[PDB]
Ligand binder design. Sequence first.
Ligand code: PLP
Ligand code: PLP
Lengths: 388, 400
Amino acid sequence: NRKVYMDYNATTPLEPEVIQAVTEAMKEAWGNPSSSYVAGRKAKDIINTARASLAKMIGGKPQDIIFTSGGTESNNLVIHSTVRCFHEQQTLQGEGTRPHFITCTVEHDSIRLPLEHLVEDQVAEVTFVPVSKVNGQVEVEDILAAVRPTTCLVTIMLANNETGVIMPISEISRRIKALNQIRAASGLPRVLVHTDAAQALGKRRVDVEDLGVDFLTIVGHKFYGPRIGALYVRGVGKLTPLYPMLFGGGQERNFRPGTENTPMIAGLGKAADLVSENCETYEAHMRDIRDYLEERLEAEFGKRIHLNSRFPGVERLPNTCNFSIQGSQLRGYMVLAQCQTLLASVGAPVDVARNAVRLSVGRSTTRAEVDLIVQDLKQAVNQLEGPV
Amino acid sequence: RKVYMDYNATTPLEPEVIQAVTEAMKEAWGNPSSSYVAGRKAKDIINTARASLAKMIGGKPQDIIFTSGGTESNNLVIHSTVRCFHEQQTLQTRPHFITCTVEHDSIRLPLEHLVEDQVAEVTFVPVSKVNGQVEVEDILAAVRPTTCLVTIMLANNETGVIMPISEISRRIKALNQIRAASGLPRVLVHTDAAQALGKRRVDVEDLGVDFLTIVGHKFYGPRIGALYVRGVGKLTPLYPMLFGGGQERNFRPGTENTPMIAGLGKAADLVSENCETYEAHMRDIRDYLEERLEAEFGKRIHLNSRFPGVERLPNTCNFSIQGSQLRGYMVLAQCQTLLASVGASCHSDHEDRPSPVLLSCGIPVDVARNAVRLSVGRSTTRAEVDLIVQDLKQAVNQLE
Ligand SMILES: *Cc1c(COP(=O)(O)O)cnc(C)c1O
Ligand SMILES: *Cc1c(COP(=O)(O)O)cnc(C)c1O
């Protein structure tokens, strides 16, 4: 009678171990993090341990991790800091010359909107680069060609939010690194690189040395953790500048003031541990379920269905299947409205985007669950488009 | 057994609050706007908690915006004010702010930042060197043609003294009609009420303010907060600092932290239900504390939170014992039982400078240098009061 959840890329339930860490921290580490009494000291140690956990998860160092209220804050912080950094570099050499940003057309709202805002306000310029109407992967050459003397930052999501396709962050980092050497010769400042890794963590190995990026966004609720987040900044305050959006009491080394939310940090820390320990096991399970699912969808729907995440040679998240079924009555929201068991979300090439549905599986998803939603999808399609 | 007397720094979570959070983590984990059970439960928790917070302060649910904490809430009002001035111009010179000299770091630092960068001008009104309260006439005399916001904490967190928020609002209301005749913008009023919630009745209609900061962890709630904005979108503007997914009507985007919000809501229900009880208890215990300190130290102790006719939070006792070896951090270093603080906790790093806040209220450096802040709570007993006074007696002796 039960529902089958396949919307893990939108949010995830909390691992039981995460829930416990949060509950315990609330109970026992309720003190102000600076203090020397027990509850305070336990909060300090928890925060310190969680910082190390997030660093390990991404192959960075504890000091490179700044805790935030969520992915949105992390994303806005990078964008904000960049504008400030540019202004600080023009006042140090000395609406007029404005910071320039390079991003892609399919970013999350918390990257696209802050950037649209800066353009509307005439505070900055932005190039939104298109994804490949084929792979739906940005092309590295479009990013390098959009660079200007005032370009400050390239922010590109690690994976396509609708389809799961992996963007080429490594190559982008390497080729920007080479360009920075020429820029530096001409007294031009370094273009930094940020990646919103929100969808990758817990699903695919994320290593900052491998990615070569300067900033990386971490989002708790995408990996069975609580609703807070963090931001990685390569050697923050030494190798990479970070200007804060908030002002106050000194916490997070004045990069992000406000009393630390110990329980949330304890949960994010545990969530991160679990990724560090089991990423490969998660990814394998996800891949088995998503592949079995795509086998069942082609068996059932045949020529009528188009798998929008799958391309030969194109790496993608292990758990994502974005598909479209041909037919004027199979618009994505209509298909989902008619399903009685499946929980998923709309997944949106033009005619195909209107009928796109994004299925995203999780750590517990089973083939038996897959069978239930293919059957569900079968009745929904019959109701709407009818037999063909 | 340690005895805790640093409730103004942070409080433990009520058991009911811890439970609201745990239940929410388990059952209300979904997206608030989705129609599946885990999502619908989250939408209900959020709506209920917004109502709880509105009831706690005498306002309406739509006037409430959830935030990551007091720091975010205070920064938000200051940022939105700069923006609003800018937008009002454009549709037609730097905005001017009025605050006082003893505000929390999250009001003082964002305002200082605005001055340093030449974005705005700010008058930091000194408080009475007598009792430590900022005075209505000094705030009103500080008004300029471009003044667009007056921000003044409800209660100072180091001494507990209550600021005349009501009168300030009344007077600015009066002034705004005169300003309107000339076309000057209206002056809005915000109060950082962090220290007042759960200790004294907070009512926005009595306070007459346009904005009010709410801080979870000062009232046995979780480490998140909120911001009251009177008739937001209709009588008061709120420009966001964050851009993204549409949450909080775009005033504050980002997936809602449902468990934290459940916790916040339960803590507010307890204030609504029991505020007068917590207040009376705090006052009984604090006044008892002051009597024992006086009976044990006589003329050697100065009660820095206590003046005649000066209203103060019911749980706070800032005191100094005269003596060259009695610097506040030294006394606390020697106490074996009592956990208190020399001033505010985000200043834990420089426990050896006299309090700048105490200084600004008119306390000698000799007296402020020795100041210790005791802030009691819902559970504090007279027995515990007796234990820490002896602990202080032995601390002062080992020292002097
Ligand atoms: C506790 C407090 C705040 C908020 O501080 P956070 O560190 O963000 O919890 C703001 N103002 C006052 C007066 C406070 O006491
Ligand atoms: C989930 C997500 C975010 C963060 O959104 P929040 O509501 O703040 O959690 C950012 N970027 C991507 C690619 C995401 O999937």
